[PDB]
Design a binder for these strands. Structure first.
Ligand SMILES: [Mg+2]
Ligand SMILES: [Mg+2]
Lengths: 50, 191, 109, 138
RNA sequence: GACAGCAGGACGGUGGCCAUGGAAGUCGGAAUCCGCUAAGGAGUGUGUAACAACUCACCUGCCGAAUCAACUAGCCCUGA
């Protein structure tokens, strides 16, 4: 299962920030949902671990 | 606030020889030649220096968005100069669970054919870009190396591979399966 | 941090550098890559007796001795100065024996 | 030849080695009972109890449990009677007054490691170190 | 000489202290001083169940001129 490769796959699919209003996956450092459908809010939450 | 003449400084090394016919940039080097078309950008391009090959990218007036634009030309000319000297190399370790993933190169380095992909029966035939080669690397478990000149084409190929390997209707925090980009680098090392 | 505060923030280093300014001929230009372990005491303890080793930010020390010089010379320790982690044991002792003891006497010795 | 350096096995209050540990002395080495039963049997009688150093410094086909301590064990040593508790006796608080000189008499066999001068060094360091002793010498 | 970026560290009296279930700053508790300095928080955390590399706080080099934080109102967008 190779935990370094697990770190790589979790880097590509786990540690993202999810916006509470637009529900889009963004980036681990991002502050704002880039979508027009909510309008660039600063309302986020981290993506849930197992 | 309608600024004036922002200018970026692009050094050019000794091996490569640049030649522009307008906003169309044509670069020659050891690893093939290269060109792009910057027509829609409306920025003064000029070069100065007898065999020193300094390039300046100059935009007058503008807006804040266009002062943001004037650095992007500098960065793309930097990436073209890195490519035409060295070339870009993407190293991808395939991460597989209880099912293996078989990856073959079907014809001449262009076509990539992915199999067995979580036990799916569907053979996944993916067509890469023109101007880029792909090889299963040696001395490492299921590492796949893509080599090319234009970084947009090479990384679009890598994106096509990692979006060909995408898990449907499951958790994607479990089922961490796919072919992902692990390392970005140059063709010739130590440079 | 309000300039001097007469406390130990900014112009106490700019009291020590400029008040240990009239006791020496020969800043010595000791520089080490890392001192995180007991290397700190390896700098001071072996060179005690005449134990000094004081220099803060080289960014602080750009116009510092220039504006508060009044010593004419020893500003020929100019732009060869800033660069590199330099500790400055400014001394008053005999000849090169100081540098000789340091030619190795902290990191492997 | 068959010699090895220290491991610092302590945090115990008895002697001999926290149990009858003079039988499992053999193992992944070739040592022998040379200082597990005589010098520790005197060292408990000399500097009895209170979890000092006592490391294993094997030199030639034999053990060597020669004790080389430093501070905070040598300032927990500031006592005149150990009326033992054997466990759990209300966490017995030996916060005891020390005499006027912990400066030249309780520091001289302990020094060469404070990395300073003498008078501004070890003397002033042990006063900041003593967190079980503090009853104000004055 | 900030601001982010690259480079260096991130101690010692001191395996300090509550414990001996670990704790040698890393689940928890009281606290908390000082020295060396360029600065280290009797240590933000990563991670070995624990020992350890490691980072953060804090500090120094290359750098070059504006940068950061709140708050307000015009247009536009979300709300629709
Ligand atoms: Mg389901
Ligand atoms: Mg509207």
């Amino acid at each position: 299962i190779e935990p370094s490769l697990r770190q790589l796959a979790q880097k590509y699919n786990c540690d993202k920030m999810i916006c509470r209003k637009c529900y889009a996956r963004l980036h681990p450092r991002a502050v704002n949902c880039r979508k027009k459908k909510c309008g660039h809010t600063n309302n986020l939450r981290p993506k849930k671990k197992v | 606030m309608k600024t004036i003449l922002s200018n970026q400084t692009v050094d050019i090394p000794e091996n490569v020889d640049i030649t522009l016919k307008g906003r169309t940039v044509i670069v020659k080097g050891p690893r093939g030649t290269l060109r792009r078309d910057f027509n829609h950008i409306n920025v003064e391009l000029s070069l100065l220096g007898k065999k020193k090959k300094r390039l300046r990218v100059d935009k007058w007036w503008g807006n804040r968005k266009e002062l943001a634009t004037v650095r992007t030309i500098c960065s793309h000319v930097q990436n073209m100069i890195k490519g035409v000297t060295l070339g870009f190399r993407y190293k991808m370790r395939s991460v597989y669970a209880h099912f293996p993933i078989n990856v073959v190169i079907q014809e001449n380095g262009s076509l990539v054919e992915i199999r067995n992909f979580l036990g799916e029966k569907y053979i996944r035939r993916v067509r890469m870009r023109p101007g880029v080669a792909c090889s299963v690397s040696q001395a490492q478990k299921d590492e796949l190396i893509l080599e090319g000149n234009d970084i947009e084409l090479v990384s679009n190929s890598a994106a096509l591979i990692q979006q060909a390997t995408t898990v449907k209707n499951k958790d994607i925090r479990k089922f961490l399966d796919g072919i992902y980009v692990s390392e970005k680098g140059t063709v010739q090392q130590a440079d | 941090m309000p300039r001097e505060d007469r406390a130990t923030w900014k112009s106490n280093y700019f009291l020590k550098i400029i008040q240990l300014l009239d006791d020496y001929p020969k800043c010595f230009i000791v520089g080490a890559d890392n001192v995180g372990s007991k290397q700190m005491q390896q700098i001071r303890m072996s060179l005690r007796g005449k134990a000094v080793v004081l220099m803060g930010k080289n960014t602080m020390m750009r116009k510092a001795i220039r504006g508060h010089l009044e010593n004419n010379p020893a500003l020929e320790k100019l732009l060869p100065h800033i660069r590199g982690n330099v500790g400055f044991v400014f001394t008053k002792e005999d000849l090169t024996e100081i540098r000789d003891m340091l030619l190795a006497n902290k990191v492997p010795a | 030849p068959n010699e090895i350096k220290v491991v610092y096995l302590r945090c115990t209050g008895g002697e001999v080695g926290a149990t009858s540990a003079l039988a499992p002395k053999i193992g992944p080495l070739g040592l022998s009972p040379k200082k597990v039963g005589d010098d520790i049997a005197k060292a408990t009688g000399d500097w009895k109890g209170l979890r000092i150093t006592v490391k294993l410094t094997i030199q030639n086909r034999q053990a060597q449990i020669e004790v080389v301590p430093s501070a905070s064990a040598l300032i927990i040593k500031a006592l005149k009677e150990p009326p033992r508790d054997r466990k759990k006796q209300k966490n017995i608080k030996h916060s005891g007054n020390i005499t006027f000189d912990e400066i030249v008499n309780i520091a001289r066999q302990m020094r060469h490691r404070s990395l300073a001068r003498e008078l501004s060094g070890t003397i002033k360091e042990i006063l900041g170190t003593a967190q079980s002793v503090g009853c104000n010498v004055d």
